[PDB]
Amino acid sequence: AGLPRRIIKETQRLLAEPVPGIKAEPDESNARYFHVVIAGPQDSPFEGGTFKLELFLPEEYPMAAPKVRFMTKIYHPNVDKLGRICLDILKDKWSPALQIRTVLLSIQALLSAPNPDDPLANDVAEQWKTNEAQAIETARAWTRLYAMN
Amino acid sequence: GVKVPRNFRLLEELEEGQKGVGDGTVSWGLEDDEDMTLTRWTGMIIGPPRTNYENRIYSLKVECGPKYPEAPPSVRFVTKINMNGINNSSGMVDARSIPVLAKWQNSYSIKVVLQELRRLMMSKENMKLPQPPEGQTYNN
Numbered sequence: 001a002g003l004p005r006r007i008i009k010e011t012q013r014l015l016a017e018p019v020p021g022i023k024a025e026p027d028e029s030n031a032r033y034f035h036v037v038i039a040g041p042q043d044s045p046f047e048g049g050t051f052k053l054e055l056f057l058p059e060e061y062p063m064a065a066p067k068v069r070f071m072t073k074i075y076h077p078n079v080d081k082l083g084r085i086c087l088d089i090l091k092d093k094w095s096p097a098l099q100i101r102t103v104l105l106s107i108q109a110l111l112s113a114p115n116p117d118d119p120l121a122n123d124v125a126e127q128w129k130t131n132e133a134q135a136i137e138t139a140r141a142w143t144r145l146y147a148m149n
Numbered sequence: 150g151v152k153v154p155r156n157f158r159l160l161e162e163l164e165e166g167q168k169g170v171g172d173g174t175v176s177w178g179l180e181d182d183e184d185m186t187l188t189r190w191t192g193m194i195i196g197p198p199r200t201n202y203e204n205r206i207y208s209l210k211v212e213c214g215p216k217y218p219e220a221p222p223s224v225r226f227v228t229k230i231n232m233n234g235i236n237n238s239s240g241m242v243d244a245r246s247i248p249v250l251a252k253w254q255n256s257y258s259i260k261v262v263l264q265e266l267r268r269l270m271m272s273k274e275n276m277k278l279p280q281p282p283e284g285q286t287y288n289n
């Protein structure tokens with residue numbers, strides 16, 4: 001009557017063995033919906049900040065990829081104004097062998113290594129390419145403004 | 150009975166709004182392109198032909214609150230309109246008077262609401278109402 005074993009397993013293993021720097025807790029009404037907090041990675045302009053991310057396991061999971069979005073404003077060439085990302089492994093490169101966990105530490109890696117070179121980077125990319133020092137300071141400024149409480 | 154959470158539903162509606170539907174006589178999009186909460190939307194309805202709404206573009210504000218889509222959105226016309234179920238002084242759409250809202254189901258969407266309002270503009274009791282001057286908007 002319930003969830004697939006895989007989902008029961010992935011959930012339970014998340015609460016038993018969290019990714020370092022990532023808190024992930026299921027929603028109080030929807031067992032396929034998770035409220036995630038990612039710590040800004042060490043040595044990034046996001047360091048010291050905490051960033052909300054939401055994750056949803058659609059009906060066809062794991063055939064279908066999980067859906068994710070940031071819900072804390074962040075200055076990054078691969079996260080847009082509404083928190084959306086275009087992560088290869090969430091589309092073209094998704095497969096059932098990958099797990100939720102792969103997705104989360106991969107998002108942390110994206111924060112650690114912004115890619116303004118990506119075809120689908122947002123409009124922040126130009127500043128990141130041409131004045132990287134200023135772009136990184138702005139990322140730190142937005143961390144101070146939006147990610148410290 | 151897998152429910153798609155509010156925020157992911159609204160992301161779907163954002164994509165659909167950008168793609169557009171049907172003949173383009175209704176459209177919707179986010180009011181503030183930095184609103185991560187996806188709460189405030191702009192709706193558009195082209196008044197249907199052979200009614201007193203014809204050849205007018207109606208702008209609306211649609212608010213998807215914390216319980217959407219389990220609960221209906223709140224809707225108000227910005228463009229002035231004389232239409233049953235719409236408060237003619239404020240533009241507020243009375244949920245009890247518009248069937249899609251009064252009988253809301255979680256399968257409905259912003260698109261459905263706007264399509265319903267456009268259908269109701271063709272109703273016998275609305276299509277002949279004399280309208281306010283074109284282009285006028287309510288205050289607030």
Ligand SMILES: *c1ccc([N+](=O)[O-])o1
Pocket residue numbers: 077078079080081084085086087120121122
């Ligand atoms: C895909 C969705 C948003 C982005 N981005 O780079 O901001 O990519």
